[PDB]
Amino acid sequence: HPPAVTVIGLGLMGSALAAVLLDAGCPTTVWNRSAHKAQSLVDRGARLTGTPREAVEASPFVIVCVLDYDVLYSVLAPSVDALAGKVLVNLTSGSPEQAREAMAWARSHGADYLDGAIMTTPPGVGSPEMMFLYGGPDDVFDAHRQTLAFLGDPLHLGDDPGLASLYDVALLGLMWSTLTGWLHGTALVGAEKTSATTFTPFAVRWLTAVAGFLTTYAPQVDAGRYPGDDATVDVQIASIDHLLHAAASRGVDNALPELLKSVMEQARAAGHGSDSYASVIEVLR
Amino acid sequence: HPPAVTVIGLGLMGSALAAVLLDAGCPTTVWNRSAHKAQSLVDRGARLTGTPREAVEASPFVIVCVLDYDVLYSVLAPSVDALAGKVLVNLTSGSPEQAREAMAWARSHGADYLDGAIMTTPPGVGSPEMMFLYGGPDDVFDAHRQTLAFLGDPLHLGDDPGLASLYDVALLGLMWSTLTGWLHGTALVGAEKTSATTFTPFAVRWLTAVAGFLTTYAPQVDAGRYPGDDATVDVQIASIDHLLHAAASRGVDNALPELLKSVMEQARAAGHGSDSYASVIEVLR
Ligand SMILES: NC(=O)c1ccc[n+]([C@@H]2O[C@H](COP(=O)([O-])OP(=O)(O)OC[C@H]3O[C@@H](n4cnc5c(N)ncnc54)[C@H](OP(=O)(O)O)[C@@H]3O)[C@@H](O)[C@H]2O)c1
Ligand SMILES: NC(=O)c1ccc[n+]([C@@H]2O[C@H](COP(=O)([O-])OP(=O)(O)OC[C@H]3O[C@@H](n4cnc5c(N)ncnc54)[C@H](OP(=O)(O)O)[C@@H]3O)[C@@H](O)[C@H]2O)c1
C-alpha cells in the first residue's frame, strides 16, 4: 500500500530515486528543468509534468534532489501555496544551517519536512545496505519510514534537520580524503606498471584494517588522550618520508602527503611525538 | 615442526612479532639496542643476546624490524660474516629503492632475502586476516611461507623486493589520508556534542561504500577515461563547499578539505568537470 510520490530533479541521483520508487510500485510523478532527462522514466510509467507545481500537487509525498538549496527555493517558490499538508523530503546536499532554514520555510507553508543525505552513488539507491541519514521530527520520520526504506536503510539521526547534513559533510570529507590518497598511491604503483585493477583489491582489503583503526581511536578522540601503544606519530613521520621520496621520483604530485606530514609535524611540535595518530586532532582544533 | 627464529628490533612492532613466534612454538632469540624492552619476552621464554651478531648466529631464520634501513645496516654490518646460509626477512619500513639495495647486499654475503611490509598495527600480528606483503625470489618465499603464516596472511607480490615497499607507501598514504579526513569530520560533529564513538560506526560503514567506489574507478584510472555516470567533479566541488563552511564555523582547521577542493578545481580547469572523481588522478601527474 505505497503512496503516490513525486520527485523534483532528475539528475544522476534524482533519476535513480525515481526509478526505484517506480519499481517499488509507487505512482510516480516527476519534474526536471530539462525534460529530456525524464524520457526513460516516462517510458517505464512515470508521469512528467510541465511545471514543478503540478508535480507537487500530484502527490502527498515529495522528494527534492537538485544541485543545492538555492535551486530548491528557486524551483519551488512558485509552488509554496501547494505545499500545505504535504511531506517534503529534501535529499539535496547542503550545510546544517541550510537544512534548518529549509525546515522553517516548509513549515511556514504548512508542509511536513525531513532533511536527508544519500550515502551512496546512484547504483546503490534501492539497496538496504546504503545509508540514508535523516533529520527532522520523529512523527514525520515514523509515518514515512516504509516509503524511505524503498531507497535504502533510513537512519533517523534525531529531531534537528541539520544533523543529517552535519554527518554528511563529515562523511564526504572522509570520502574525498580516501579517494585522493588512493589515487595518489595508484599513480605511484602505476609508474611501475602495476595496474589500478591489480593494486585496488589490496587497497580495499587494507581499508578494513584502517576502519579498525578508526574504531580503536574513537574513545581516544573523546578522552583527549592518545596512548602510543600501537604506533607513534614520530614513527609515522619517518615512514611518510618513504612515500614522499617514492612519489617524487615517479612524477607524482606530493601536495597531499606534504600536508599530511606537516600535520604530523604540527602534532609532534605540540608534544604528541609518542602519542597515537589520533593526537593529530589536537592540531585541527 | 617450527624452526629457530631470531628477531632484531623489539619496538612496538618487533615485540609483537617475537611474541607471536614464541606462542607458535619457535625457539625465539632476540636483540634490541635497549635491552629493557626484552624483559617481558625473556620472562616468557625468549633468549636475549648482548649483540646482534649472536642473535643472527643463533637462528637460520632472521627477522629485522627496526626504525629504518640505515639502522638495519648499522646493526647488521658487524654480522655480515654470519649471514651466509641464513634467511633474512626484512619487515622494516622503507622505499622500493632501499629494498632492492638490501637484497643485493644480503645476497653478497650469502643470505637469502625477502622484503616485507606489515599491513597491521601490533595487535593484529598473528591474525590470518592481516596482510603481510612480500617481494623477493619465489623459492625463498615458498620455502618459508609456513613460518611467515604465523605472523599473518603472507602475500607474495613477485620476484622484485621493491614491490612490497611500493605497495606499502601507496597503502600508507591511503591510510594517513583516511585517518586525517576521519579526524577532521570527527572534530566537526564533535563541536555539536556528537561523540567520536557515536560518529565512528557511521564512518566505518561508509568506508565499505567508499571502498566500492575504488573498485568502480580502478578500470577508469587504467584507461585514462573517467565517465561521469555516477557523480561528477563539478557536483563534488559544490558539496565540498558545504563541508568547508560547516567546519570554518565550528573552529576546525580547513587545510585538508581546501587542498582537496583545490585538487578538484584543478581537475575541472583541465576539462574534467563532467567526469568522475577518478579524473583527479590526471592532475596528480
Ligand atoms: N550523484 C551522487 O552520487 C550523489 C550522491 C549523494 C548526493 N548527491 C546530491 O544530490 C544532488 C543532485 O546531484 P546529481 O548528482 O543528481 O547532480 P546532477 O546530475 O548535476 O543534477 C543536478 C540537478 O539540479 C538541477 N538544477 C541545477 N540548476 C538548476 C536550476 N537553476 N533550476 C532548476 N534545476 C536546476 C538539474 O537540472 P537539469 O537536469 O535541468 O540541469 C538537475 O536536476 C546534489 O546536491 C548532490 O550533492 C549526489
Ligand atoms: N607499529 C606499527 O604499527 C607498525 C606497523 C607496520 C610497520 N611498522 C614499521 O616497523 C618499524 C619499527 O616500528 P616500531 O613501530 O616498532 O617503532 P619503535 O617502537 O620506535 O621501534 C623502533 C626500533 O628501532 C630501533 N632503533 C632505532 N634507532 C636505532 C639505532 N640508531 N640503533 C639501533 N636501533 C635503533 C629501536 O631500538 P630502541 O628500542 O633501543 O629504541 C626499536 O627497536 C618501522 O619501520 C615502522 O614503520 C610499524
XYZ file of C-alpha atoms and ligand atoms in Angstrom:
666
model
C 0.000 0.000 0.000
C 2.591 2.614 -1.123
C 1.573 6.275 -1.556
C 1.788 8.456 -4.663
C 5.242 10.058 -4.802
C 6.779 12.999 -6.629
C 10.448 13.533 -7.409
C 11.688 17.036 -8.257
C 15.053 16.881 -10.015
C 16.039 14.161 -12.459
C 19.817 14.448 -12.454
C 22.093 11.459 -11.932
C 20.721 10.939 -8.429
C 17.160 12.187 -8.899
C 16.647 9.743 -11.800
C 17.793 6.841 -9.707
C 15.435 7.780 -6.851
C 12.505 7.965 -9.266
C 13.443 4.622 -10.889
C 13.471 2.842 -7.501
C 10.169 4.373 -6.398
C 8.683 3.303 -9.686
C 9.916 -0.298 -9.301
C 8.592 -0.396 -5.707
C 5.013 0.175 -7.010
C 4.584 3.895 -6.232
C 2.557 6.015 -8.616
C 5.489 8.199 -9.639
C 5.323 11.808 -10.870
C 8.401 13.766 -11.910
C 9.704 17.122 -12.945
C 13.045 18.421 -14.108
C 14.108 21.737 -15.736
C 15.436 19.700 -18.697
C 12.511 17.495 -19.701
C 14.597 15.173 -21.887
C 16.051 13.530 -18.752
C 12.551 12.269 -17.907
C 12.138 10.295 -21.117
C 13.360 6.920 -19.926
C 11.324 7.272 -16.734
C 8.149 8.231 -18.647
C 8.587 5.190 -20.962
C 8.598 2.993 -17.792
C 5.457 4.536 -16.226
C 6.381 7.892 -14.658
C 4.261 10.969 -15.303
C 6.177 14.114 -16.329
C 4.532 17.485 -15.531
C 5.302 20.774 -17.295
C 5.865 22.672 -14.049
C 7.095 21.878 -10.515
C 3.778 22.991 -9.080
C 1.762 20.321 -10.921
C 4.281 17.709 -9.746
C 3.932 18.934 -6.151
C 0.102 18.921 -6.428
C 0.091 15.357 -7.755
C 1.423 13.610 -4.607
C 1.242 13.840 -0.788
C 4.949 12.819 -0.638
C 7.521 14.977 -2.396
C 11.262 14.316 -2.762
C 13.621 17.042 -3.965
C 17.095 16.249 -5.252
C 18.595 19.207 -7.122
C 22.077 20.772 -7.142
C 21.707 22.908 -3.999
C 19.173 24.607 -1.758
C 19.148 27.907 -3.705
C 17.858 25.913 -6.694
C 15.286 24.231 -4.436
C 13.855 27.616 -3.347
C 14.079 28.861 -6.914
C 12.030 25.968 -8.423
C 9.586 25.664 -5.500
C 8.942 29.402 -4.867
C 6.023 29.342 -7.310
C 4.527 26.245 -5.537
C 4.551 27.492 -1.926
C 0.724 27.667 -1.797
C 0.516 23.964 -2.784
C 2.861 22.636 -0.094
C 0.291 22.582 2.744
C -0.398 19.079 4.085
C 2.454 17.624 2.027
C 5.621 15.925 3.227
C 8.763 17.320 1.649
C 11.867 15.113 1.849
C 14.887 17.080 0.817
C 17.781 14.854 -0.366
C 19.656 17.796 -1.821
C 23.199 18.281 -0.439
C 23.692 21.285 1.877
C 25.005 22.653 5.174
C 23.344 22.156 8.589
C 22.355 25.846 8.573
C 20.597 25.477 5.189
C 18.764 22.365 6.401
C 17.344 24.167 9.446
C 16.262 27.137 7.343
C 14.554 24.848 4.811
C 12.546 23.170 7.555
C 11.355 26.525 8.920
C 10.438 27.616 5.360
C 8.483 24.389 4.617
C 6.683 24.597 7.955
C 5.746 28.231 7.255
C 3.855 26.960 4.175
C 2.190 24.102 6.100
C 4.340 21.160 4.981
C 5.994 18.400 6.970
C 9.746 18.319 6.347
C 12.665 15.887 6.575
C 16.223 16.599 5.554
C 18.218 13.681 4.196
C 21.682 12.771 2.984
C 22.209 9.970 0.456
C 25.321 7.925 1.392
C 25.706 6.115 -1.963
C 26.143 6.853 -5.648
C 23.093 6.222 -7.905
C 23.580 2.452 -8.492
C 23.244 1.738 -4.752
C 19.903 3.541 -4.421
C 17.430 0.738 -3.628
C 19.996 -1.321 -1.710
C 19.152 -1.748 2.006
C 22.893 -1.628 2.872
C 23.167 2.000 1.721
C 22.677 4.592 4.481
C 20.221 7.440 4.060
C 20.584 9.815 7.028
C 17.569 11.850 8.119
C 16.902 14.721 10.493
C 13.544 16.181 11.472
C 10.550 15.309 13.650
C 10.090 11.729 14.953
C 6.443 11.657 13.865
C 7.232 12.560 10.262
C 10.052 10.025 10.022
C 7.970 7.271 11.639
C 4.959 7.928 9.378
C 7.114 7.796 6.234
C 9.804 5.244 7.099
C 8.289 2.485 4.996
C 8.458 4.633 1.824
C 12.010 5.833 2.677
C 13.044 2.190 3.155
C 12.470 1.669 -0.591
C 15.510 3.866 -1.258
C 17.874 2.319 1.286
C 18.453 1.998 5.031
C 16.773 5.015 6.543
C 18.544 6.206 9.700
C 16.906 8.945 11.720
C 19.622 10.918 13.487
C 17.204 12.994 15.564
C 14.846 15.953 15.570
C 17.402 18.550 14.354
C 17.331 18.616 10.495
C 20.902 19.950 10.411
C 22.169 16.660 11.857
C 21.829 14.862 8.519
C 23.940 17.462 6.775
C 26.423 17.631 9.680
C 27.174 13.910 9.373
C 27.051 14.128 5.558
C 29.811 16.742 5.099
C 31.941 14.960 7.706
C 31.447 11.646 5.857
C 32.052 13.249 2.438
C 35.342 14.752 3.708
C 36.348 11.243 4.738
C 35.426 10.012 1.219
C 37.316 12.732 -0.656
C 40.348 12.167 1.585
C 40.292 8.395 0.953
C 39.735 8.740 -2.828
C 42.577 11.215 -3.221
C 45.050 9.187 -1.123
C 44.027 6.118 -3.130
C 44.547 7.987 -6.412
C 47.946 9.268 -5.248
C 49.090 5.730 -4.357
C 47.629 4.308 -7.563
C 49.634 6.860 -9.616
C 52.724 5.760 -7.713
C 52.447 1.976 -8.256
C 51.224 2.715 -11.816
C 54.555 4.325 -12.731
C 55.951 0.818 -12.062
C 53.393 -0.832 -14.393
C 51.185 -2.192 -11.615
C 47.638 -1.578 -12.930
C 44.992 0.140 -10.764
C 42.926 -3.035 -11.144
C 45.796 -5.064 -9.652
C 46.519 -2.622 -6.774
C 42.976 -1.779 -5.764
C 41.869 -5.094 -4.203
C 44.798 -4.665 -1.752
C 43.584 -1.124 -1.019
C 40.038 -2.382 -0.435
C 41.223 -5.068 1.955
C 43.538 -2.605 3.711
C 40.583 -0.267 4.277
C 39.020 -2.925 6.535
C 42.049 -2.718 8.844
C 42.103 1.088 8.578
C 38.408 1.173 9.587
C 39.541 -0.857 12.634
C 41.991 1.936 13.462
C 39.061 4.375 13.440
C 37.192 2.157 15.921
C 40.224 1.950 18.247
C 40.949 5.667 18.122
C 37.381 6.956 18.697
C 37.497 6.658 22.524
C 40.939 8.347 22.393
C 39.476 11.312 20.492
C 36.601 11.637 23.042
C 39.037 11.437 26.008
C 41.645 13.850 24.578
C 44.254 11.235 25.389
C 46.181 9.300 22.755
C 48.341 6.464 24.093
C 51.111 5.411 21.660
C 50.596 1.661 22.349
C 50.291 0.601 18.691
C 52.186 3.116 16.559
C 53.562 6.600 17.220
C 53.400 9.922 15.375
C 57.244 10.002 15.265
C 57.391 6.602 13.561
C 54.755 7.715 11.045
C 56.725 10.889 10.166
C 59.706 8.651 9.326
C 57.587 6.340 7.110
C 55.717 9.113 5.267
C 59.153 10.320 4.013
C 59.408 6.977 2.189
C 56.089 7.762 0.475
C 57.236 11.287 -0.424
C 60.582 10.023 -1.827
C 58.963 7.209 -3.825
C 56.297 9.553 -5.262
C 58.699 12.422 -6.096
C 60.919 10.097 -8.131
C 57.911 8.812 -10.135
C 56.434 12.186 -11.100
C 53.549 12.171 -8.645
C 52.453 15.495 -7.166
C 53.088 15.425 -3.404
C 50.845 18.234 -2.176
C 48.649 15.772 -0.257
C 51.282 13.760 1.633
C 53.280 17.004 2.263
C 50.241 18.398 4.037
C 49.735 15.137 5.999
C 53.417 15.237 7.030
C 53.063 18.872 8.106
C 50.014 17.976 10.195
C 52.024 15.186 11.897
C 54.954 17.591 12.460
C 52.498 20.075 13.984
C 51.250 17.369 16.358
C 54.841 16.396 17.268
C 55.711 20.071 17.983
C 52.698 20.192 20.339
C 54.117 17.264 22.356
C 52.438 14.298 20.636
C 55.509 12.548 19.101
C 54.963 9.493 21.270
C 51.158 9.517 21.038
C 48.976 7.676 18.540
C 47.951 9.296 15.226
C 44.578 10.234 16.782
C 46.515 13.004 18.606
C 46.585 14.785 15.210
C 43.056 16.009 16.039
C 44.742 18.321 18.607
C 46.128 20.388 15.719
C 42.820 20.503 13.817
C 41.062 22.286 16.729
C 57.974 -28.593 13.440
C 58.796 -24.844 13.527
C 62.372 -23.548 13.084
C 64.556 -21.492 15.439
C 63.856 -17.804 14.797
C 65.623 -14.541 15.622
C 64.031 -11.100 15.806
C 66.242 -7.997 15.610
C 64.404 -4.943 16.971
C 61.953 -5.039 19.879
C 59.969 -1.848 19.333
C 56.174 -1.809 19.368
C 56.125 -3.969 16.233
C 59.246 -6.098 16.779
C 57.951 -7.131 20.237
C 54.689 -8.281 18.784
C 56.452 -10.343 16.096
C 58.597 -12.047 18.728
C 55.561 -12.716 20.975
C 53.696 -14.453 18.123
C 56.693 -16.558 17.128
C 57.091 -17.553 20.747
C 53.409 -18.612 21.030
C 53.724 -20.607 17.771
C 56.409 -22.833 19.412
C 59.549 -21.334 17.812
C 62.771 -21.255 19.777
C 62.940 -17.459 19.864
C 66.118 -15.341 20.154
C 66.012 -11.548 20.302
C 68.085 -8.438 20.318
C 67.359 -4.775 20.766
C 69.636 -1.754 21.395
C 67.667 -1.112 24.610
C 67.707 -4.439 26.432
C 64.962 -3.498 28.897
C 62.356 -3.880 26.099
C 63.203 -7.587 26.003
C 62.288 -8.223 29.626
C 58.742 -9.431 29.189
C 59.769 -11.573 26.226
C 62.649 -13.154 28.182
C 60.285 -13.926 31.122
C 58.077 -15.880 28.651
C 60.937 -17.916 27.075
C 62.846 -15.678 24.621
C 66.654 -15.593 24.737
C 68.203 -12.111 24.704
C 71.743 -11.806 23.289
C 74.167 -8.974 24.096
C 74.917 -8.317 20.411
C 73.078 -8.598 17.078
C 75.718 -10.994 15.803
C 74.984 -13.638 18.467
C 71.282 -13.273 17.691
C 71.981 -13.778 13.966
C 74.204 -16.813 14.681
C 71.532 -18.401 16.867
C 68.902 -19.000 14.132
C 68.642 -19.961 10.428
C 65.680 -17.544 10.130
C 66.192 -13.887 10.987
C 63.559 -11.134 11.038
C 64.573 -7.449 11.252
C 62.089 -4.768 12.278
C 63.893 -1.549 13.213
C 63.171 2.131 12.532
C 64.657 2.296 9.012
C 67.192 0.641 6.728
C 70.146 2.818 7.842
C 69.672 1.349 11.318
C 69.475 -2.144 9.762
C 72.885 -1.698 8.051
C 74.258 -0.132 11.192
C 73.274 -3.071 13.483
C 73.953 -5.847 10.916
C 77.221 -4.583 9.395
C 79.208 -6.284 12.161
C 77.380 -9.623 11.473
C 77.943 -9.863 7.684
C 80.275 -12.863 8.108
C 77.482 -14.771 9.902
C 74.757 -14.198 7.293
C 75.710 -16.989 4.878
C 73.053 -19.718 4.559
C 70.580 -17.655 6.597
C 67.257 -16.209 5.525
C 66.828 -12.552 6.344
C 63.247 -11.261 6.331
C 63.231 -7.506 6.485
C 59.938 -6.062 7.829
C 61.436 -2.627 8.346
C 59.622 0.215 6.534
C 61.467 1.758 3.562
C 61.387 2.718 -0.111
C 61.435 0.320 -3.096
C 64.976 1.515 -3.899
C 66.167 0.639 -0.358
C 64.539 -2.790 -0.592
C 66.372 -3.659 -3.824
C 69.697 -2.469 -2.409
C 69.192 -4.504 0.772
C 68.562 -7.668 -1.234
C 71.739 -7.171 -3.273
C 73.697 -6.556 -0.029
C 72.271 -9.680 1.709
C 72.911 -11.827 -1.372
C 76.504 -10.550 -1.492
C 77.040 -12.063 1.976
C 75.366 -15.369 1.073
C 71.949 -14.874 2.665
C 68.508 -15.484 1.259
C 66.411 -12.316 1.474
C 62.755 -11.275 1.485
C 61.448 -7.774 1.894
C 58.111 -7.398 3.666
C 55.530 -4.831 4.673
C 53.316 -5.341 7.735
C 49.752 -4.146 6.941
C 48.506 -4.051 10.560
C 49.313 -2.488 13.912
C 50.856 -4.776 16.574
C 47.601 -6.296 17.965
C 46.762 -7.816 14.560
C 50.123 -9.584 14.227
C 49.225 -13.281 14.390
C 45.821 -12.813 12.764
C 45.483 -14.580 9.375
C 43.274 -11.688 8.123
C 46.172 -9.219 8.306
C 48.175 -8.804 5.079
C 51.945 -9.155 5.065
C 53.232 -8.243 1.588
C 56.464 -9.817 0.375
C 58.866 -9.317 -2.503
C 61.831 -11.499 -3.421
C 62.583 -14.882 -5.010
C 59.731 -17.446 -5.371
C 61.869 -20.249 -3.934
C 62.683 -18.346 -0.745
C 59.058 -17.337 -0.180
C 57.810 -20.889 -0.859
C 60.409 -22.462 1.461
C 59.494 -20.091 4.321
C 55.766 -19.492 3.855
C 54.759 -21.699 6.774
C 56.809 -19.626 9.262
C 55.586 -16.333 7.715
C 51.982 -17.596 8.038
C 52.416 -17.488 11.841
C 52.557 -13.675 11.588
C 49.592 -13.178 9.262
C 48.488 -13.746 5.662
C 51.674 -13.810 3.628
C 51.128 -12.480 0.102
C 53.997 -12.784 -2.354
C 53.833 -9.879 -4.804
C 56.624 -11.220 -7.024
C 60.389 -11.501 -7.550
C 61.156 -7.768 -7.213
C 61.804 -6.929 -3.494
C 60.841 -3.287 -4.092
C 57.248 -4.350 -4.814
C 56.451 -4.808 -1.114
C 57.565 -1.291 -0.288
C 55.929 0.144 -3.445
C 52.522 -1.143 -2.346
C 53.278 -0.244 1.291
C 53.906 3.510 0.809
C 50.904 3.728 -1.515
C 48.738 1.943 1.088
C 50.126 4.049 3.969
C 49.278 7.253 2.048
C 45.735 5.959 1.706
C 45.679 5.284 5.493
C 47.039 8.682 6.528
C 44.591 10.403 4.198
C 41.628 8.425 5.591
C 42.639 8.942 9.254
C 43.066 12.689 8.806
C 39.743 13.105 6.907
C 38.085 10.998 9.620
C 39.603 13.152 12.356
C 38.557 16.363 10.574
C 34.946 15.122 10.335
C 35.032 13.881 13.922
C 36.104 17.381 15.095
C 33.213 18.819 13.107
C 30.393 16.667 14.530
C 32.114 16.866 17.948
C 31.594 20.649 18.090
C 27.875 19.705 18.110
C 28.332 17.224 21.016
C 28.202 14.092 18.866
C 30.940 11.855 20.366
C 33.603 10.177 18.204
C 32.277 6.849 19.463
C 28.787 7.768 18.182
C 30.015 9.077 14.773
C 32.599 6.402 14.012
C 30.319 3.407 13.329
C 28.739 5.555 10.543
C 32.242 6.286 9.205
C 33.178 2.608 9.282
C 30.038 1.623 7.399
C 30.521 4.453 4.923
C 34.050 3.196 4.205
C 32.553 -0.021 2.803
C 30.706 2.005 0.145
C 33.794 4.159 -0.450
C 35.893 1.011 -0.996
C 33.294 0.106 -3.661
C 33.957 3.453 -5.363
C 37.648 2.479 -5.555
C 36.679 -0.799 -7.255
C 34.489 1.017 -9.822
C 37.090 3.674 -10.596
C 40.158 1.380 -10.999
C 39.439 0.468 -14.663
C 38.843 4.192 -15.318
C 42.265 5.068 -13.883
C 43.968 2.411 -16.087
C 42.105 3.591 -19.232
C 42.634 7.338 -18.709
C 38.893 7.805 -19.229
C 36.509 8.852 -16.471
C 32.804 8.723 -17.363
C 30.619 10.904 -15.083
C 27.825 8.253 -14.880
C 27.517 8.215 -11.062
C 28.695 11.595 -9.767
C 30.669 14.474 -11.308
C 33.667 16.544 -10.195
C 31.534 19.727 -10.561
C 28.861 18.411 -8.213
C 31.565 17.407 -5.698
C 33.089 20.914 -5.755
C 29.658 22.287 -4.808
C 29.237 19.825 -1.911
C 32.763 20.253 -0.501
C 31.901 23.975 -0.008
C 29.241 22.813 2.468
C 31.986 20.933 4.362
C 34.290 23.961 4.331
C 31.501 26.303 5.545
C 30.359 23.913 8.297
C 33.947 23.323 9.504
C 35.012 27.002 9.417
C 32.084 27.991 11.626
C 32.970 25.276 14.202
C 36.656 26.060 14.660
C 38.027 23.204 12.582
C 41.203 23.831 10.582
C 40.369 23.502 6.863
C 43.789 22.915 5.329
C 42.817 19.387 4.267
C 39.469 19.972 2.566
C 40.886 23.209 0.998
C 43.583 21.119 -0.643
C 41.002 18.510 -1.774
C 38.849 21.327 -3.203
C 41.883 22.779 -4.998
C 42.644 19.379 -6.489
C 39.048 19.121 -7.776
C 39.235 22.705 -9.133
C 42.484 21.774 -10.872
C 40.773 18.777 -12.484
C 37.811 20.952 -13.543
C 40.186 23.523 -15.097
C 41.787 20.690 -17.101
C 38.369 19.780 -18.571
C 37.174 17.117 -16.117
C 34.174 18.887 -14.538
C 31.791 16.359 -16.070
C 33.988 13.332 -15.401
C 34.016 11.093 -12.329
C 36.311 11.836 -9.357
C 38.860 9.311 -10.697
C 39.758 12.027 -13.279
C 41.510 13.801 -10.391
C 44.462 11.437 -10.996
C 45.105 13.474 -14.192
C 46.156 16.397 -12.010
C 48.459 14.298 -9.762
C 50.945 13.501 -12.575
N 25.368 11.614 -7.711
C 25.630 11.169 -6.487
O 26.296 10.157 -6.326
C 25.086 11.867 -5.271
C 25.135 11.205 -4.072
C 24.627 11.828 -2.940
C 24.068 13.087 -3.023
N 24.029 13.735 -4.197
C 23.429 15.083 -4.214
O 22.207 15.110 -4.978
C 22.051 16.423 -5.571
C 21.891 16.355 -7.090
O 23.023 15.665 -7.615
P 23.173 14.904 -9.033
O 24.454 14.148 -8.875
O 21.878 14.223 -9.434
O 23.587 16.157 -9.932
P 23.200 16.462 -11.439
O 23.018 15.190 -12.215
O 24.054 17.651 -11.874
O 21.749 17.126 -11.282
C 21.555 18.440 -10.764
C 20.051 18.689 -10.731
O 19.750 20.011 -10.330
C 19.013 20.656 -11.385
N 19.308 22.096 -11.487
C 20.508 22.690 -11.399
N 20.381 24.033 -11.519
C 19.068 24.290 -11.675
C 18.241 25.486 -11.855
N 18.857 26.684 -11.881
N 16.905 25.333 -11.982
C 16.314 24.123 -11.950
N 17.015 22.992 -11.782
C 18.357 23.017 -11.653
C 19.429 19.940 -12.644
O 18.514 20.177 -13.698
P 18.900 19.948 -15.267
O 18.801 18.471 -15.488
O 17.799 20.721 -15.970
O 20.275 20.544 -15.384
C 19.441 18.527 -12.114
O 18.124 18.018 -11.944
C 23.279 17.224 -5.176
O 23.058 18.037 -4.004
C 24.310 16.168 -4.834
O 25.306 16.725 -3.971
C 24.525 13.157 -5.310
N 53.898 -0.085 14.946
C 53.225 -0.307 13.827
O 52.006 -0.252 13.846
C 53.930 -0.661 12.536
C 53.221 -1.263 11.514
C 53.879 -1.601 10.336
C 55.232 -1.307 10.201
N 55.903 -0.700 11.196
C 57.327 -0.407 10.991
O 58.198 -1.162 11.839
C 59.423 -0.474 12.040
C 59.684 -0.353 13.533
O 58.457 0.131 14.065
P 58.011 0.263 15.588
O 56.565 0.673 15.456
O 58.409 -0.999 16.333
O 58.708 1.608 16.158
P 59.523 1.724 17.561
O 58.691 1.065 18.644
O 60.025 3.144 17.658
O 60.815 0.830 17.275
C 61.998 1.354 16.702
C 63.030 0.237 16.710
O 64.218 0.621 16.023
C 65.325 0.608 16.957
N 66.290 1.695 16.651
C 66.005 2.964 16.286
N 67.140 3.677 16.080
C 68.164 2.840 16.300
C 69.637 2.919 16.250
N 70.212 4.084 15.909
N 70.367 1.832 16.557
C 69.771 0.685 16.910
N 68.431 0.545 16.965
C 67.606 1.549 16.676
C 64.692 0.754 18.324
O 65.508 0.330 19.412
P 65.260 1.031 20.883
O 64.071 0.294 21.434
O 66.584 0.728 21.551
O 64.993 2.489 20.577
C 63.452 -0.087 18.135
O 63.742 -1.477 18.192
C 59.249 0.877 11.364
O 59.921 0.787 10.102
C 57.734 1.043 11.224
O 57.320 1.894 10.149
C 55.279 -0.389 12.341
